[PDB]
Design a protein around this ligand. Structure first.
Ligand SMILES: O=C1CCCN1Cc1cc(Cl)c2cccnc2c1O
Length: 124
């Protein structure tokens, strides 16, 4: 089985919209989305389809840009740092499950550098 995907809404959790969260969606996520290396990260890891049956035996806090996009569109986050933490979880998961120099890791590392450049300055 794949596990249930991470939540993209939670009525118990307070919502917020900030200039910085708007920028993470309009500029950061939407630019990374178009990168040629973004496709493995645009949805939860489908362990069944991809025949990685040990993925969720290893990765206990999964995250992906499809989930982040939905969360941003939902105003699920309280602040930009919560969203940035999801991006970092997504990258770290890929480095945990895979090995240095792997093709998928080279893709994550290219996205991560672009992500870091984009968040170097956020709006006020
Ligand atoms: O780790 C991550 C980060 C986002 C996707 N993903 C899982 C994944 C997907 C694919 Cl197509 C792989 C292909 C070859 C080797 N490894 C793979 C892999 O580990």
């Amino acid at each position: 089985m794949n596990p249930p995907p991470p939540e993209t809404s939670n009525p118990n959790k307070p919502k917020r919209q900030t200039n910085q969260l708007q920028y993470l969606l309009r500029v950061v996520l939407k630019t990374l989305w178009k990168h040629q290396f973004a496709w493995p990260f645009q949805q939860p890891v489908d362990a069944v389809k991809l025949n990685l049956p040990d993925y969720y035996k290893i990765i206990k806090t999964p995250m992906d840009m499809g989930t982040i996009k939905k969360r941003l569109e939902n105003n699920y986050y309280w602040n930009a740092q919560e969203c940035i933490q999801d991006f970092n979880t997504m990258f770290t998961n890929c480095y945990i499950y895979n090995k240095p120099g792997d093709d998928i890791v080279l893709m994550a590392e290219a996205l991560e550098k672009l992500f870091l450049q984009k968040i170097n300055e956020l709006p006020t």
